[PDB]
Amino acid sequence: KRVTKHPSLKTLTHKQIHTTIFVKSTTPYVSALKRINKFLDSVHKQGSSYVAVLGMGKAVEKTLALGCHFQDQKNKKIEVYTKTIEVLDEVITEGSDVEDDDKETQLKKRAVSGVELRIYV
Amino acid sequence: VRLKSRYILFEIIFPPTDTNVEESVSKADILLSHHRASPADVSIKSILQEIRRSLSLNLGDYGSAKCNSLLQLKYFSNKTSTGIIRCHREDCDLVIMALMLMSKIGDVDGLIVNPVKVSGTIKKIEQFAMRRNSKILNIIKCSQSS
Amino acid sequence: MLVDLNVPWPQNSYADKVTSQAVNNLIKTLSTLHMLGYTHIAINFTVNHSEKFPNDVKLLNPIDIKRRFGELMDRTGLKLYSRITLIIDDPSKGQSLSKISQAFDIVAALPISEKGLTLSTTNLDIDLLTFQYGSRLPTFLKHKSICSCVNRGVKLEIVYGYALRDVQARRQFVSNVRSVIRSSRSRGIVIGSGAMSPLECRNILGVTSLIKNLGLPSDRCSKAMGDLASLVLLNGRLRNKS
Amino acid sequence: INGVYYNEISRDLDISSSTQCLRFLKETVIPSLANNGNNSTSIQYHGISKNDNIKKSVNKLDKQINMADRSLGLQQVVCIFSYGPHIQKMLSILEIFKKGYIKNNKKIYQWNKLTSFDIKREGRNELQEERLKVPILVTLVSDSEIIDLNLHSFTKQ
Amino acid sequence: GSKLNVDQFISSRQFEVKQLQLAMHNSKAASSTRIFQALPRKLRRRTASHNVRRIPKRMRNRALREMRKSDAHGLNAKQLYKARMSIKLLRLASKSTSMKLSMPPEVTSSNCHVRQKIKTLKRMIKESSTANPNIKLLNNRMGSYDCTGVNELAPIPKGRVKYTKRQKHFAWLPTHIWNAKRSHMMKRWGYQMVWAPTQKCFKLTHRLGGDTCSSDGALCMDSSYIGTIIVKDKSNDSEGDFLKSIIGKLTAERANLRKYREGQVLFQGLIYSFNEENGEDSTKPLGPCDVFWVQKDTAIIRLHPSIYTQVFNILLQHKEKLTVQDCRYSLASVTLKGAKALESLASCLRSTEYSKSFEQFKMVSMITDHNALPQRCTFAFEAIDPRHLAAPKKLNDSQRKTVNSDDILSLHENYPQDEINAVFNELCDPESRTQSYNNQNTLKEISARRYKLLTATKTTVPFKESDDPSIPLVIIRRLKTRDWIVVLPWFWLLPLWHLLNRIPRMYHIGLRQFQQIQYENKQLYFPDDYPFTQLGYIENSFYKKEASKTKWDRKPMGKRINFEKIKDIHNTKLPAYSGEIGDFFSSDWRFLQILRNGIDYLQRNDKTLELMDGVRDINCVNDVLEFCKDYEAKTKAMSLSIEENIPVALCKNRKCQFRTSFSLTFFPRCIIAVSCTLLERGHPKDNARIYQVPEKDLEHWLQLAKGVYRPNGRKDHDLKIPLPEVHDLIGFITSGTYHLNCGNGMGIGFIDHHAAIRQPTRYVLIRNVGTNTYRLGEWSKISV
RNA sequence: CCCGCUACGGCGUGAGCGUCAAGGUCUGUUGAGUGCAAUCGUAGGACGUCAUUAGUGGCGAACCCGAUACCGAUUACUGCUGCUGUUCCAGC
RNA sequence: GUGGAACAGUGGUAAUUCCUACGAUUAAGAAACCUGUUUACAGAAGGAUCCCCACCUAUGGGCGGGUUAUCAGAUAUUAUCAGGUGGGAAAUU
């Protein structure tokens, strides 16, 4: 059965967008270190307390590896929160020969547990 | 119109030559044992007079003539023993090789000079020095907390 | 990441026992090497070719990386390799390579003789060739003996630690190193720090400037210090393991 | 994998063996972060592997939040823990359990902790030895707001 | 040298860091710079030294004090009347368009006289003074009219009397002068659309309008060039029988879904031009298309302007029962893109009635997200003229700080079809858009109303159901291009458009920037990334070939790259051939299809293919290549306009089963669209060659994909790369730009489907222009 | 301005909104973006010009160089291209 | 009037010749320098198969309790890296 997915809700203000990284599964480690270090350099200009690191699914483990790096080697105070994430998925329900993407699309919700990780200055 | 002169950051490191005294094996502990202190008679003019004598006795006269065109010490403080030497982009090789062969000061011997950062601007060298000292404070704080 | 492969062991003969001051001096100078910043450490030991080799298996190496340096390996965050430079002058009391290559890792030689250079390029499957930069040039370097040996795989080594010894030795040092540079065709040049004291160690920026002003370009110097050094390390490692 | 280290101390562990590392987390890591002697807490330990059934583990968590005696005045804390790629499954068995609890007009007070193992491996290069840092999730859940455990290093949720 | 304590060390080093930071800040403060340089680089004004009004008001006092510290012509008897003629014409034109009446056609054409214009504008005022009838009297003060052409194409619009001969050859956007002050435009089609912003906005539009998460802004594109037609069935008042048939004739059975009838969502897809003369049907790939429906029967179709002229000609060919509606100067849309585009768009508009669509759009405007919403989001309502506000203000309710998918599904369940489709019926009909201009006021009038509110009573102008121009407003989602497009009448667009970027986080888009947005989202673009279609092939090949040939013959000898003498290109270098594959310039699909049919003829002739040695006996590669060079030398004398050479395969693979005389090029070759990402070092460029992985060297490229490098520690590709043969080519990258959202190189290529089913793995190598290196990558299928 | 305590103006949170002020900041910075002002060094291959004793050597420049971006005009130099004017030399 | 050589004036256009590789960090932004690998997900959200014990029925099977093995596109790799860096004039205002 053919089914496709969509990304998640990101309700963000003017100040939340420049201090939050969303870690993918294809995100490299040292790339994430450089981006969160640039966020720690720019958070004084943004003027907020923490830098947020959010992950869901396969990235979560290596997302936690980010919290395993800056807590010990750079003495940063981190906060770990476990959240739920709703994801809408378009699925095909059987009811000529048409193209595979041109079928009946029905929305179905699917919940995934994820990790938010706040890093202080 | 402007001039393209390069700046060189150097740091004075004292090797702990103590044959009868034991040693502790750690990272930030040996950073403490090498980054101890500068001695009393260290100033801008003393380092300049020593490096000009090393430039004379090591590299000669006409090489010293090429090096001493813009050979100045722009910023130096004895509390941290880090200094910035202005030079040309062509004779930067000659200035770094003169910094390498620095053997001793006329008052205090037993020291090495570490050239760390070279750039054509001093503002990015200061930004690199603040980040490097921040990493030193990170290593010190990691060994101090545990 | 950098490789420094020319730190000497304070002992010349097996009859002489290493004192407690020399071990502490070696610990101080290797900690000074880690202080300025180096990844690989391959400490060297001098063996004369006129010396009679012992018929032992686990006693060929008086270095003992495991019992002494095994703590500093865990604490500091580095590693140690063992290597031997062979002071070979005449073909007598020798021709044994199948036993000394298995215990140690990197096999180097020090020819000071005219026929010694030929027997080193001919019948010695060694890693590095070292010349005495302290003393005078042996006879003359030519392209014929060097180019036939560099193309085989053996690299020529320059010791920038021998330059910080005396004032008069610096002139003979430059006269030897520039001859090695013009004879080497700027390809097989591996450089190493021959420091016996912690007061004679330098960093990459000064040594690169030194080798740049002595006559090697900036591409070949840094490319050598990375690639050729870490290649001859696995050359010794595959001569050990395989 | 050449060796597993915890808190820069040499340990005899295997990452492919789940039982030994879960017993090492149960016996060594949790007494190193929480002390049950000097207070009146009833701590129920549970570890989660990636082969565990979600419904059965939630039903096991449905009995550990009401296991100790209610007359003795003991506050009941469930210490759930995992390490590495099993943690995600833990998260499901975490949050679905929360989905099994907030519908009855009640609350879970939650404390999170992130520590790590450091494992050594040989690289694709022989002389290059690689370090990998494996994360550990430790979550203490309870129905009480204030717990007398030494939980200053945790994260209130 | 003496050992010190730990606390004294960290205190001294922290004091040194603080001293260096204070010294850097003191040097930055002692550097003699103006407060004019204190502005950001986007807002820096060169003329701010002349007049102070460009500077912010907080900073203008310091600008005045530092500016104080730092410190009717000769005209003959004829040119005076020549200057007064224009001033009198402007005054009479202002009074005529302002008082009561519309524009005469003789002033619009502007090709006879100016004294007749003066006499006509004098006569209309006298006829309004002496009599009430015989007057084409308007409905407003501002000179707005109804440029709607029923059953025919819309002519050249009237516009303004002063700027009339400037509209003689090419027409204008409604925001022409506004965009002209702030952007670079190019004259390509009959309009003059923007091409690129004046300030550099490559990475800026890439980060704010792109698919990146850090997109704190809004990007607006003037898309008035996209032409729409409205079709309605005049034959029957009941269900639409001929509408489904004409949709199935204009498009394939790909956009004629029952789902698109029920859920009425707009769909963008591929249209192909049909031609049925007598018993024969010839189908050619035409281009892009946007189809939208109103519940069963009426349809708006919008697409590219030359394709719009061609579709309008084909639709006017068969116009027997249904009534067509051309809308070139009465309806246009603008495109918003980003994360805060919905917030700025809801900031620009206000409500005139409590309805459901306002509640849906205001909840959509707060989530700051695009793809979490469903496929159908087509909202429509009645709103106020945005000249009432004239200030950057946002309106947001309390809402208890909660955003979930349950409310999104609740808005998905309840959709107000009746009012939204009534707004659609208002915008399709010419009578309702004419009735919309019944209360349009001048800026003087709205300033007077704002002064009346400031005198009586807040920064607003209230709504009146009797004497305020309630407009129809439609905001819809466009799916594959990931952007929100909002459509509105022609003269209403500018009061909406001027208030948009006065929100301080909203910038404008150029056509090169729109190409960058389509390149970032793995999407496609018609003038550049569509080479298969007729017009795309003609325009792209002709313009890029002539431009590159003019640049190549323009450069002197020995400074440019020399395409004639390049050694070591392929293994076993073929005789009478020393250059690169095809012409060195823009994509030679003719060369590719002749070489593909040559390799197909070699495979049909024998089980293997030989390497080397009126049409000569084809037995190897160079006999095909000499025929290619001869056909290129023949088509350099006479241009080719007969047929196409490369269609797509994605419509052919599903149903037609991609099935393929002394023939070398009669039956064309079909392609699928791919997007290949670089795994090796390097970046692609435009017109890049796309080759197969060799089957003898497949394990070497698999080892390079896993890992192989020198023992230093960093990646190595300075190795003996094995060169494959010439005939291993499978495609062309048209758009090559370094992809910043991935950190690697992206190339949009088009590969053969038979070649795609040849290899079991998706590993395909790329080669640049005039560069002899080969770079492996992996492709993903583009279903556009 | 909404929630809880208290009730004469009060107090605690929302990483909520609107107005006002502040020489607190502007790498909020641009398919180069510095601000005591970076725009590098070297090796190999391809092409062009000029000089050779065996075949190789030298050169790819002159003017000049950002600091918000755009475009017009002017000035400094090399090469190509079209036109015009002058001088010299012949085919009859 | 023509062809060649030289000079002068104006109009138009171009300028690192192009490509390739290398240039220290668990202290992960030190070849001089900048940007990027941030719209988080393996239909692993009551996941699938399987072990032991007890129950009911029998031609299939299901439930409860306990520890826990296998699996998540190239059976692999969590810790690397890519691209660019001066112009007609940027000088003149």
Short mmCIF file of N, CA, C and O (backbone and C1' of nucleotides) in Angstrom, two decimals, chain E residues 46 211-214 551 554-555 559 561 681-683 714-715 738 740-743 763 771 775, chain G residues 13-15 17-25 35-39 74 81-84 93:
data_model
loop_
_atom_site.label_atom_id
_atom_site.label_comp_id
_atom_site.label_asym_id
_atom_site.label_seq_id
_atom_site.Cartn_x
_atom_site.Cartn_y
_atom_site.Cartn_z
N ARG E 46 22.32 56.10 0.19
CA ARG E 46 23.39 56.96 -0.29
C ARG E 46 22.97 58.43 -0.26
O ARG E 46 23.79 59.31 0.04
N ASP E 211 13.46 26.20 1.86
CA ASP E 211 12.92 25.07 2.61
C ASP E 211 13.67 24.92 3.93
O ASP E 211 13.44 23.98 4.68
N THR E 212 14.58 25.85 4.21
CA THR E 212 15.30 25.84 5.48
C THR E 212 14.36 26.22 6.62
O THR E 212 13.37 26.94 6.43
N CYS E 213 14.67 25.73 7.81
CA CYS E 213 13.84 25.99 8.98
C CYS E 213 13.99 27.42 9.46
O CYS E 213 13.01 28.06 9.83
N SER E 214 15.22 27.93 9.46
CA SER E 214 15.46 29.32 9.85
C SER E 214 15.00 30.26 8.75
O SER E 214 15.82 30.79 7.99
N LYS E 551 29.36 35.23 -26.89
CA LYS E 551 30.38 35.37 -25.85
C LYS E 551 31.68 34.66 -26.24
O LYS E 551 32.78 35.13 -25.91
N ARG E 554 33.30 36.59 -28.87
CA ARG E 554 33.61 37.89 -28.29
C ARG E 554 34.93 37.91 -27.54
O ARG E 554 35.67 38.89 -27.65
N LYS E 555 35.26 36.85 -26.80
CA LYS E 555 36.50 36.76 -26.03
C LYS E 555 37.70 36.61 -26.96
O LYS E 555 37.58 35.96 -28.02
N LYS E 559 42.69 33.46 -23.65
CA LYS E 559 42.27 33.91 -22.33
C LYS E 559 41.06 33.12 -21.85
O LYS E 559 40.86 32.93 -20.65
N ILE E 561 38.68 29.43 -22.11
CA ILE E 561 38.93 27.99 -22.25
C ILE E 561 38.74 27.59 -23.70
O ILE E 561 37.78 28.00 -24.36
N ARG E 681 33.60 14.98 -3.90
CA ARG E 681 33.96 16.39 -3.85
C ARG E 681 33.67 17.05 -5.20
O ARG E 681 33.80 16.42 -6.25
N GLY E 682 33.23 18.30 -5.16
CA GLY E 682 32.94 19.05 -6.37
C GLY E 682 31.51 19.56 -6.44
O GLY E 682 30.65 19.17 -5.64
N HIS E 683 31.26 20.44 -7.40
CA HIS E 683 29.94 20.99 -7.66
C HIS E 683 29.63 20.93 -9.15
O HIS E 683 30.55 21.02 -9.98
N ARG E 714 42.20 12.27 5.92
CA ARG E 714 41.24 13.05 5.15
C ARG E 714 41.00 12.39 3.80
O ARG E 714 41.81 11.57 3.34
N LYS E 715 39.87 12.74 3.17
CA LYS E 715 39.38 12.04 1.98
C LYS E 715 40.29 12.24 0.77
O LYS E 715 40.84 13.33 0.57
N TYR E 738 25.34 25.20 -6.73
CA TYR E 738 25.74 24.59 -5.47
C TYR E 738 24.59 24.63 -4.46
O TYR E 738 24.13 25.71 -4.08
N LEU E 740 22.89 24.72 -1.22
CA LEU E 740 23.27 25.13 0.12
C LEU E 740 22.45 24.46 1.22
O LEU E 740 22.89 24.43 2.37
N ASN E 741 21.26 23.95 0.90
CA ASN E 741 20.43 23.31 1.92
C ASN E 741 20.88 21.89 2.23
O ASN E 741 20.45 21.32 3.24
N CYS E 742 21.74 21.30 1.40
CA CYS E 742 22.27 19.97 1.64
C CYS E 742 23.76 19.98 1.94
O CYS E 742 24.26 19.05 2.58
N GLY E 743 24.48 21.02 1.52
CA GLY E 743 25.92 21.07 1.71
C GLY E 743 26.67 20.36 0.61
O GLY E 743 27.88 20.13 0.72
N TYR E 763 23.63 4.63 -9.07
CA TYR E 763 24.90 5.34 -8.97
C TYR E 763 25.33 5.77 -10.37
O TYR E 763 25.59 4.94 -11.24
N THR E 771 35.94 20.24 -18.18
CA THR E 771 36.67 19.66 -17.07
C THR E 771 36.68 18.14 -17.23
O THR E 771 35.62 17.54 -17.46
N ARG E 775 32.59 12.55 -11.41
CA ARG E 775 32.13 12.62 -10.02
C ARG E 775 30.86 11.81 -9.83
O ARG E 775 29.84 12.10 -10.46
P U G 13 30.20 48.15 -24.81
"O5'" U G 13 30.97 46.76 -24.67
"C5'" U G 13 30.43 45.57 -25.22
"C4'" U G 13 31.50 44.55 -25.47
"C3'" U G 13 32.41 44.25 -24.28
"O3'" U G 13 31.84 43.31 -23.39
"C1'" U G 13 33.71 44.58 -26.24
P A G 14 32.24 43.33 -21.83
"O5'" A G 14 33.61 42.53 -21.77
"C5'" A G 14 33.67 41.15 -22.12
"C4'" A G 14 35.07 40.62 -21.99
"C3'" A G 14 35.83 41.07 -20.75
"O3'" A G 14 35.53 40.27 -19.62
"C1'" A G 14 37.19 41.39 -22.65
P A G 15 35.68 40.89 -18.14
"O5'" A G 15 37.17 40.51 -17.72
"C5'" A G 15 37.65 39.18 -17.86
"C4'" A G 15 39.15 39.14 -18.01
"C3'" A G 15 39.94 39.41 -16.73
"O3'" A G 15 41.08 38.56 -16.68
"C1'" A G 15 40.50 41.04 -18.40
P U G 17 45.54 34.34 -14.47
"O5'" U G 17 45.32 34.32 -16.05
"C5'" U G 17 44.12 34.80 -16.64
"C4'" U G 17 43.41 33.74 -17.46
"C3'" U G 17 42.85 32.55 -16.69
"O3'" U G 17 41.59 32.82 -16.10
"C1'" U G 17 43.99 31.80 -18.64
P C G 18 41.08 32.02 -14.80
"O5'" C G 18 40.81 30.53 -15.31
"C5'" C G 18 39.67 30.21 -16.08
"C4'" C G 18 39.71 28.78 -16.56
"C3'" C G 18 39.78 27.72 -15.48
"O3'" C G 18 38.52 27.43 -14.90
"C1'" C G 18 41.36 27.23 -17.17
P C G 19 38.42 26.93 -13.37
"O5'" C G 19 38.92 25.42 -13.42
"C5'" C G 19 38.18 24.42 -14.11
"C4'" C G 19 38.96 23.15 -14.26
"C3'" C G 19 39.42 22.48 -12.98
"O3'" C G 19 38.40 21.73 -12.34
"C1'" C G 19 41.21 22.53 -14.53
P U G 20 38.36 21.61 -10.74
"O5'" U G 20 39.54 20.61 -10.40
"C5'" U G 20 39.52 19.26 -10.84
"C4'" U G 20 40.82 18.55 -10.56
"C3'" U G 20 41.34 18.67 -9.13
"O3'" U G 20 40.68 17.80 -8.23
"C1'" U G 20 43.11 19.06 -10.64
P A G 21 40.14 18.38 -6.83
"O5'" A G 21 41.23 17.91 -5.77
"C5'" A G 21 41.78 16.60 -5.83
"C4'" A G 21 43.21 16.57 -5.35
"C3'" A G 21 43.48 17.25 -4.02
"O3'" A G 21 43.14 16.44 -2.91
"C1'" A G 21 45.13 17.88 -5.59
P C G 22 42.58 17.11 -1.56
"O5'" C G 22 43.89 17.65 -0.83
"C5'" C G 22 44.94 16.76 -0.46
"C4'" C G 22 46.18 17.51 -0.05
"C3'" C G 22 45.99 18.55 1.04
"O3'" C G 22 45.95 17.99 2.34
"C1'" C G 22 47.27 19.49 -0.71
P G G 23 45.01 18.63 3.47
"O5'" G G 23 45.81 19.93 3.95
"C5'" G G 23 47.08 19.81 4.57
"C4'" G G 23 47.78 21.15 4.65
"C3'" G G 23 47.01 22.28 5.31
"O3'" G G 23 47.07 22.23 6.72
"C1'" G G 23 48.01 23.05 3.31
P A G 24 45.82 21.71 7.58
"O5'" A G 24 46.41 20.51 8.44
"C5'" A G 24 45.64 19.89 9.45
"C4'" A G 24 46.45 19.62 10.69
"C3'" A G 24 45.71 19.77 12.01
"O3'" A G 24 44.98 18.61 12.36
"C1'" A G 24 47.80 20.89 12.12
P U G 25 43.42 18.48 12.00
"O5'" U G 25 42.75 18.01 13.37
"C5'" U G 25 43.53 17.36 14.37
"C4'" U G 25 43.41 18.07 15.69
"C3'" U G 25 42.09 17.90 16.42
"O3'" U G 25 42.01 16.69 17.15
"C1'" U G 25 42.70 20.19 16.41
P U G 35 30.15 32.99 8.31
"O5'" U G 35 29.26 32.16 7.28
"C5'" U G 35 28.26 32.80 6.49
"C4'" U G 35 27.79 31.91 5.37
"C3'" U G 35 27.18 30.59 5.78
"O3'" U G 35 25.82 30.70 6.17
"C1'" U G 35 28.75 30.22 4.05
P G G 36 25.21 29.72 7.30
"O5'" G G 36 25.09 28.31 6.57
"C5'" G G 36 24.18 28.11 5.50
"C4'" G G 36 24.44 26.80 4.80
"C3'" G G 36 24.38 25.56 5.67
"O3'" G G 36 23.06 25.10 5.88
"C1'" G G 36 26.32 25.49 4.30
P U G 37 22.69 24.26 7.20
"O5'" U G 37 23.12 22.77 6.84
"C5'" U G 37 22.55 22.09 5.73
"C4'" U G 37 23.32 20.84 5.40
"C3'" U G 37 23.44 19.82 6.52
"O3'" U G 37 22.30 18.99 6.62
"C1'" U G 37 25.56 20.15 5.50
P U G 38 21.46 18.93 7.99
"O5'" U G 38 20.38 20.09 7.85
"C5'" U G 38 20.43 21.23 8.70
"C4'" U G 38 19.13 21.42 9.46
"C3'" U G 38 18.04 22.19 8.73
"O3'" U G 38 17.30 21.39 7.83
"C1'" U G 38 18.28 23.03 10.93
P U G 39 16.60 22.05 6.54
"O5'" U G 39 15.14 22.44 7.04
"C5'" U G 39 14.04 21.55 6.84
"C4'" U G 39 13.08 21.57 8.01
"C3'" U G 39 11.91 20.59 7.91
"O3'" U G 39 11.60 20.10 9.21
"C1'" U G 39 11.08 22.78 8.15
P A G 74 19.75 -2.99 2.29
"O5'" A G 74 20.46 -2.18 1.11
"C5'" A G 74 20.82 -2.82 -0.10
"C4'" A G 74 22.27 -2.60 -0.44
"C3'" A G 74 23.18 -2.28 0.73
"O3'" A G 74 23.58 -3.43 1.46
"C1'" A G 74 23.61 -0.76 -1.02
P C G 81 37.44 15.37 6.69
"O5'" C G 81 36.35 16.04 5.74
"C5'" C G 81 36.10 15.50 4.45
"C4'" C G 81 34.80 16.01 3.88
"C3'" C G 81 34.86 17.36 3.18
"O3'" C G 81 35.38 17.27 1.86
"C1'" C G 81 32.98 17.30 4.61
P A G 82 36.19 18.50 1.24
"O5'" A G 82 35.18 19.12 0.17
"C5'" A G 82 34.23 18.29 -0.49
"C4'" A G 82 33.01 19.08 -0.88
"C3'" A G 82 33.29 20.43 -1.50
"O3'" A G 82 33.61 20.37 -2.88
"C1'" A G 82 31.72 20.70 0.22
P G G 83 34.82 21.26 -3.46
"O5'" G G 83 34.13 22.65 -3.82
"C5'" G G 83 32.94 22.69 -4.59
"C4'" G G 83 32.20 23.99 -4.38
"C3'" G G 83 33.05 25.25 -4.49
"O3'" G G 83 33.30 25.65 -5.83
"C1'" G G 83 31.73 25.38 -2.55
P G G 84 34.74 26.24 -6.23
"O5'" G G 84 34.62 27.79 -5.87
"C5'" G G 84 33.55 28.58 -6.38
"C4'" G G 84 33.36 29.83 -5.56
"C3'" G G 84 34.59 30.70 -5.40
"O3'" G G 84 34.82 31.55 -6.51
"C1'" G G 84 33.59 30.37 -3.29
P U G 93 36.34 62.29 -6.44
"O5'" U G 93 34.91 62.54 -7.11
"C5'" U G 93 34.23 63.80 -6.93
"C4'" U G 93 32.75 63.62 -7.14
"C3'" U G 93 31.94 63.32 -5.89
"O3'" U G 93 31.43 64.52 -5.31
"C1'" U G 93 31.53 61.65 -7.51
#
